[PDB]
Each structure stands twice: as C-alpha cells, then as structure tokens.
Amino acid sequence: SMIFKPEELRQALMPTLEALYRQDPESLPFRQPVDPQLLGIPDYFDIVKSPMDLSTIKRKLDTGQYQEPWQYVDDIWLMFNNAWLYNRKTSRVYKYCSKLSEVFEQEIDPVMQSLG
Ligand SMILES: CCc1c(C(=O)N[C@H]2c3cc(Cl)ccc3CC[C@@H]2O)[nH]c(C)c1C(C)=O
Ligand SMILES: CCc1c(C(=O)N[C@H]2c3cc(Cl)ccc3CC[C@@H]2O)[nH]c(C)c1C(C)=O
C-alpha cells in the first residue's frame, strides 16, 4: 500500500471526526471512554473486549498513531459496533450511535476516494 504521513492523515480525516463531535447531543455518549462503574453497568467490559471512543481516536490522529487511513476507519467502526453490541436497539445510546454512523458514512466516502 501507499505511505501516509501523520499530517496528511490529520488533514484528510480530522474533518470526518469533527463532523461526529458536532452531532449534539448524539456524540455526547462517545466523547469519553465508557466508565461502567460510574454508569451502573458492571458487565460492560465482559461484553465489550476492545473499548473505543472519540477521544481515543482524536488522540491517535493528533499523535500520529495511524499508519494508513483504514486503521482510523477501523477504530470508528469499533466504537460504533461496541455500542450496538452492548446497548439495546431501543436505547438512547444505540440510537445516537446509529445517527453518528449515518453522518460518518456520508463524510468518509468522498475522503477515502481522495486518499485511495
Ligand atoms: C449507557 C452508557 C454509555 C455511555 C454514556 O452514558 N456516556 C455518558 C458519559 C459517560 C462518562 Cl464515563 C462520562 C461522562 C458522560 C457524559 C454523558 C455521556 O452520554 N456511553 C456509551 C458509549 C455507553 C455504552 C454502554 O455504550
Ligand atoms: C445524552 C447525554 C446525557 C446523559 C447521559 O448520557 N447520562 C448517562 C450517565 C452519565 C454519568 Cl456521568 C453518570 C451516570 C449516567 C447514567 C445514565 C447515562 O448512562 N444524561 C443527560 C442529562 C444527558 C443530556 C444530554 O442532558
């Protein structure tokens, strides 16, 4: 595959991450790691083996931890798939996840075309 530099990935991908943060209120559950003790859900880490959230993805982009853009896409989908796995289909967090995923699909498609 092609080489990607960290600054190039920030320019291309940060707008797609920003679009998720700007979904308000729907991004609020995703702006920080899940805290199962605080949120009253002690089985969370038994169900969700690889936690992920927007702050972690932002830090990885900011510090240059992605070598290529599909690693970023993988982390976004990990975050979404964790929330659809743990939460019931009628719950607020599940519905907010679906909203963010719709926004992401719209934003990421032209960006990955340009990168690829
Ligand atoms: C239902 C639990 C849950 C939340 C969640 O409730 N987040 C809330 C939160 C959590 C912490 Cl630690 C600190 C602050 C805030 C502010 C509000 C924000 O909605 N987020 C997710 C992805 C889930 C689950 C189980 O997938
Ligand atoms: C959707 C964002 C939001 C939440 C919210 O996500 N609460 C979560 C939470 C957060 C903490 Cl830190 C502690 C406990 C709990 C349990 C419930 C739930 O998991 N509560 C409110 C008032 C809002 C909004 C937008 O007014």
DSSP of 68-111: SHHHHHHHHHHHHHHHHHHS-TTSHHHHHHHHHHHHHHHHHHHH
- Approach to solving: X-ray
CATH architecture designation of domain 1-116: Up-down Bundle (1.20)
**Mutational test site, ligand 2, from 28, 32, 35, 43, max ligand atoms within 8 Å of CB:** 28
CB 98 within 8 A of CB 29: no
Other C-beta atoms closer than 10 Å to the C-beta of 54 total: 22
Resolution in A: 1.5
Give the number of other Cβ atoms within 10 Å of residue 104's Cβ.
20
Instruction: Select from 112, 106, 21 the least CA-distant residue to 58.
Output: 21
Q: Rounded to whole angstroms, how far apart are CA atoms 90 and 81?
A: 15
Peptide bond into 29 cis (omega under 30): no
Residue 34 Cβ inside 6 Å of ligand 1? The answer reads yes
